[PDB]
């Protein structure tokens, strides 16, 4: 490219539409270099097709193509055309050249015209711009250099041998330039062209290179970017093999090692780095444990997978052999590893076991006794629950997703890796923490169900992860050491460097670099004390622009105070950005919008810290955020909705968190009610809607203090205390005594009052009798009179009794042994699950069908426990269903008399626990 304009427009729209891209302009943002170069060679920008890459203007296409176009013009030379661009924009040529100075110098040095830049800015301003844009210029030098023959030019008398070793192990401008280019730029600043490779600059350039690759841009890009990274590693020398740069590079090069296109490059760089950084990896065994686990797992999976169609079937055997030998060498190195930095000998044995078992695992995981996958799973779980743990969350998540993705649950439980009631009580908490993901197969959920059921049948206690209702424990685990919001945000950002994709880790490293540098320069002691306790020392050193200045490529910037805004799933993100933008003087909030908008799920984790930081900042100034938030809360708290429940939980947790932060200039904790202005009755009602009853009770007490009973009833009925309900006063009648007797789960005593009501309503042809019948059924199923409740069931013909009738229709059937009911499928009821297991036990001729039905029951019960909003009675019912299915599975798998007697003895020990436990569970 008349119709060709429109056809090309539609084609580009379809290309960027069916490639996970935003729109056609975001497809011009990736290719503007090449299009503009090849086109502006012999043409002028003013007559370009703004109809492809839908823009609706040329002054819209230019507000994005200033930099590339200007730099290319000044690369070849169109001074009058740069002036025409500038005129059209609105900015004179001089401030324009001041906007895109970096790319201009990158290309010009590459294409040799810098004197022509001196003749427009000056001879004391141009050098200031080179001082301001040094690292961005080096980054743009590594972008455009073409990999042709770098080792030839190297002999810079150390890059040659280093690149030779890393090759022995395993606009475009030629490589021959690269050294001299740097020199010519660095002979006009103070920093000498020889040695400019502090770790901040190294990580900067390396992250630039990685971010350059893209999923839509092809798997042939990656191997070129990798060659250039090898050049950077050989050139930087001793700063890219120690400290945080070492960790950072090992991560991404691992990701390039599992790429079947070329694992020849990345395996070599990885060998060189691991071999050369031995003196450092012996100081950080916690990093090496997780890296070894992740890398070994990925390698094993890549070894087993074998699908080569667009790869030369011999090229594949080559790379497979290379991978196998790297695995054998790495396993030897790990077996020989021994560090003085191990906390105890327990940690050393854990390291040995983890590495050794991971070296010999298969493609999937199992739970048998004595295999490698089961020993590795047990080691990961046992480590998870500890205080000084080796693996971090990303490494453990990788290993678990590799083992538990396709699982193999043993048929019996004598061959199981967890077979005693004691191991189950010990590992129940961690096994529940494990099955709170979504990448877990069905057989792993069945195994986790068996373990949780054995733990509850042996202890009768709920894992505490299921009982907590607020997030205050997370907020206190983050903001630890000093207990401030700055440490909380620093931990949240630091956790993104290790648990992110190239983009996210880049955003986090950039934010930390700006934060730590501004804390070092301005000598902020509070923020310094926050950093020294949130970041380990290698990351605290690689975040400091000591001999440089923070580059303009890092600091990149990017109604919600009203109702009905609480319902869109991005309320937290928009509100957090809106708040963080209102406090630019706090450096920790200035760098946030670039992370709050990109990273997913970060705004919900960081919302309380942001709100507290803003409110504490503008305490003595004009209090704007306080006024806005406290005016919006009057509408947000009175919000009954299903889509708005998950943001209401976050508002309540923010209020709770602010209650624990000391006001400056306070006499008592009774002044922490001035962070915001909450109406505590509305907050109590809201917390009752969300199912947080202890939080609701706390708010109700604060409200009553503010004063000196319709919400207290809903609180008391559901809170988990035997005696609390009786403290509530209400007007007396036979109906209220009946309500108390049905709460109390009394036997004949509620049967009397209910029979009276039921008769009086049948006689008067009242419509409440149905409800009465419902209640009666409940009562008669809490006594044990199953025949009477059965007869009360058949009579009722409108079976529309929320879920009380659903459960009552199958408890009775199981007790009377009526095995022909058609059981609903996908039901949240424990009675239905247990009934289906026993029914299948009745109508089956082989044990395999019964085992399959039991395992399906365990799997579904665990998924329902993971579903979330369950109060305590339903929770304990589901756990009791797990226990019942586990005992069923235990007696189905007996083979001789000795196991029968062992099962009986197990029943006796569990009786020991049962004698004093809660009565419903028992």
Tab-separated table of C-alpha atoms in Angstrom, residues 806-807 810 823-833 836 860-861 864 878:
chain	number	residue	atom	x	y	z
A	806	UNK	CA	-31.191	-32.112	50.659
A	807	UNK	CA	-28.972	-33.437	53.448
A	810	UNK	CA	-29.796	-38.908	52.355
A	823	UNK	CA	-28.353	-39.180	43.987
A	824	UNK	CA	-27.822	-35.735	42.446
A	825	UNK	CA	-24.524	-35.073	40.713
A	826	UNK	CA	-22.281	-32.126	41.619
A	827	UNK	CA	-23.844	-31.426	45.011
A	828	UNK	CA	-22.222	-29.583	47.902
A	829	UNK	CA	-23.680	-31.941	50.486
A	830	UNK	CA	-21.630	-34.375	52.533
A	831	UNK	CA	-24.563	-36.751	52.987
A	832	UNK	CA	-24.875	-37.192	49.228
A	833	UNK	CA	-21.160	-37.932	48.892
A	836	UNK	CA	-22.974	-42.400	46.833
A	860	UNK	CA	-14.970	-33.602	45.285
A	861	UNK	CA	-14.963	-32.986	49.029
A	864	UNK	CA	-15.606	-28.052	47.978
A	878	UNK	CA	-17.049	-31.727	55.193
